Amino acid sequence: FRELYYITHIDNVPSILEKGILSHAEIERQSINCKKVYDNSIVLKRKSRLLADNRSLWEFANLYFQPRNPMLYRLLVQGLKPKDLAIVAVKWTIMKRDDILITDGNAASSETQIYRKSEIKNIKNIISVKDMEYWREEDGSKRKIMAACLVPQCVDPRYISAIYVSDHEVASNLKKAINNRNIPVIPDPTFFFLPNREIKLTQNLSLVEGDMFFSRMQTLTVSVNTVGVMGKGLASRVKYQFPDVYVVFQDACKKKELEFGKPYLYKRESSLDAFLAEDNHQTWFLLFPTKRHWKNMSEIKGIESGLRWIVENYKKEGIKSLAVPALGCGLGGLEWSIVGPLMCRYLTKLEIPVQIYLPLEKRIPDVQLSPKFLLD
Ligand SMILES: Nc1ncnc2c1ncn2[C@@H]1O[C@H](COP(=O)(O)OP(=O)(O)OC[C@H]2O[C@@H](O)[C@H](O)[C@@H]2O)[C@@H](O)[C@H]1O
C-alpha cells in the first residue's frame, strides 16, 4: 500500500477537487481566498525557507507521508476541531514525476534535508514514518514524522484517491457538497487522534480501542513493577516519551513511596500539548504496580488493592479524569475475562470521566465488552 496526504480545512475540499492542491505561492498568484488555518508563525517560517534552483518552499505543495503528526495535532489544540478538517489522499503515482522533491522531515526545519528524486537515498527509511504512532524532539522523530513529498505549483485533481474525515456526519455533508461518487469520502477517527472504538458502559466509564497518551484524560495510569525497570511494553514507551516519569518511578520506588498495591500519583506540571504540537491542560501520571519483579506474573490482590486506592483517593488528590490501561493484560499474563470485571467493579464508582483502554495485542469476545458481563 501507499498514499500521500494533504491536511486542509473541509471548506476548501470542493475548491481542491476543482482547482487542485495549490502551493501557498500559487494561491497568492491566482488571488484565491482559500480560507484555511495555519498560524502566521508557521506561514512566515515556510516562506522564509529557500531551496536549490532559485526556488522557495512556499512554491511547492506539502504532501505528508504521515498526516497523523505534530502539524495536525497543532491545528486541533489551536481550537480547530476534527469536523473542521479533511486529509486529502494523493496516489503513490505522483512520486513518478521527476520535478518533485522529498524531505527527510519537516520541510521548514533547518536540520531537515530536501533531496530531488535523482539524488534520494534511503527512501524506505523516509516513507517508514507512516508506521510511527508517536514522536519526541530528542531523537528527531518529531521532525522526521513530517517527512513530505514537495510537488511544485499545483497537484492535478486526477491524482486524488479519496478524502479522509473525522466521523460519519462530516462524510454525508461532504459527499453531497462535492457531488462525485467517483472520489470516496472515508470516515476514520484515527487520522485525527480519536479512538478506533469507544463503548460507553455508564455516564463516566467507557472502554476504548486507541492510544491512552492521545486520550485527553487528566491522569494517565501506567502499569509498573516493584524493582525499577520499565524495560518492555507500555512502560517502555513511557520511558522514551516521558523519561522524567521513569526517573520519578525509580526515585519513588527506592523511597518505599511505591510498594506493590500502593499506587504513586506524579502531579507532573509539564504541558503535553506543547511537547506533542509543532512549536493550558495538565497531564498527571499514576504509577500502578501490577506485579513485584518484571519476570514473574501479575497478581490480582495487587490490582484489587490499587483499584481500591484509586476509588478512595481520586477525590483527595484532585484527579479530574482517568485513563487506566487493561492491568496485567499484556506481559503480566492475566486475562481480560478476570481483570475486566474487577476494574469495572471499582472504576464505575468514580464520579469523573474514566477510560479503560482495551489491550491492543489481543482479541476480546464482544460479549466480554457488554455491561451484563463487566458490571455484574
Ligand atoms: N498506547 C496504549 N494505549 C492503550 N493500551 C495500550 C497502549 N500500549 C499498550 N497498551 C496495552 O496495555 C496493556 C498493559 O501493558 P503492559 O505494559 O504490558 O502491562 P502489564 O501487563 O501490567 O505489564 C507490566 C510490566 O511491564 C512493564 O510495563 C512494567 O514495568 C512491568 O514490568 C497491554 O495489554 C497493551 O496492549
From Swiss-Prot:
Keywords: DNA-binding, Glycosyltransferase, Hydrolase, Nucleotidyltransferase, Toxin-antitoxin system, Transferase
Active site: R46 (proton acceptor), A148
DarT domain sequence ranges: 2-193
Catalytic activity: an N-(ADP-alpha-D-ribosyl)-thymidine in DNA + H2O = a thymidine in DNA + ADP-D-ribose; a thymidine in DNA + NAD(+) = an N-(ADP-alpha-D-ribosyl)-thymidine in DNA + nicotinamide + H(+)
Origin: domain of life: Bacteria
Record bears the keyword Cytoplasm: no
Region spans: ADP-ribosylating turn-turn loop: 103-148
Annotated binding of ADP-D-ribose, by residue: D211, M212, S223, V224, N225, T290, G328, C329, G330, L331, G332, L360, E361
Similarity annotation: In the N-terminal section; belongs to the DarT ADP-ribosyltransferase family. In the C-terminal section; belongs to the DarG ADP-ribosyl glycohydrolase family.
Annotated protein name in UniProt: DNA ADP-ribosyl transferase-DNA ADP-ribosyl glycohydrolase fusion protein
Protein's organism: Thermosipho africanus (strain H17ap60334)
